[PDB]
Amino acid sequence: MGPGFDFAQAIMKKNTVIARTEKGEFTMLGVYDRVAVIPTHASVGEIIYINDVETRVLDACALRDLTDTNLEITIVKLDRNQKFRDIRHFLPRCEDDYNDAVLSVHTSKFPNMYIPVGQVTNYGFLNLGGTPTHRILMYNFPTRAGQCGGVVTTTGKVIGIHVGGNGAQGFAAMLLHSYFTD
Numbered sequence: 815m816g817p818g819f820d821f822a823q824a825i826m827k828k829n830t831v832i833a834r835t836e837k838g839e840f841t842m843l844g845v846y847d848r849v850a851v852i853p854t855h856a857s858v859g860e861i862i863y864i865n866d867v868e869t870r871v872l873d874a875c876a877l878r879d880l881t882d883t884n885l886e887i888t889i890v891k892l893d894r895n896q897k898f899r900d901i902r903h904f905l906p907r908c909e910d911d912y913n914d915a916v917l918s919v920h921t922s923k924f925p926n927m928y929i930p931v932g933q934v935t936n937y938g939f940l941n942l943g944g945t946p947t948h949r950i951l952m953y954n955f956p957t958r959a960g961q962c963g964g965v966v967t968t969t970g971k972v973i974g975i976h977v978g979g980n981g982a983q984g985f986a987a988m989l990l991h992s993y994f995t996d
């Protein structure tokens with residue numbers, strides 16, 4: 815409808831796949847080469863489904879900060895025959911607050927879904943499903959089951975991936991440039 819949705823759409827059309835694990839279906843953001851991100855609670859194994867195709871998981875790491883604190887960011891390298899468009903230049907370098915963000919989801923259940931979530935707060939610490947978690951972004955929208963892995967963008971930046979909610983607020987794990995400096 816406007817330049818927020820235009821940027822969100824451009825990312826979803828080239829840089830997302832549908833990932834299925836034993837824990838369900840997730841929006842999964844491709845970042846560069848065969849490297850993608852998913853919420854750690856997806857429990858990625860040796861094998862994953864990518865757009866309903868059996869795919870070997872070449873390499874995988876759950877990111878924890880330098881106090882061994884869960885971040886909720888799992889980086890996956892997929893045994894896929896095709897690279898993602900490199901979008902690392904759209905990643906913030908620092909922890910920050912943002913205005914006018916969009917959460918975009920693409921699954922079998924919620925295709926081509928875009929939610930204007932508005933202002934995003936650098937929330938920091940969250941007890942997320944019982945797990946102490948750092949670098950959480952918060953937005954005041956009542957996000958539901960099915961949105962985990964959803965991409966959070968502003969015009970020009972990919973800032974995080976949706977990892978949970980409390981019925982009134984939604985929460986995303988920050989994406990930082992530093993996570994993907996190969």
Ligand SMILES: Cc1ccc(CS(N)(=O)=O)cc1F
Pocket residue numbers: 849873874875889890891993994995996
């Ligand atoms: C499995 C995996 C692939 C790529 C990266 C990004 S990097 N090479 O800058 O650390 C992290 C990973 F954990």
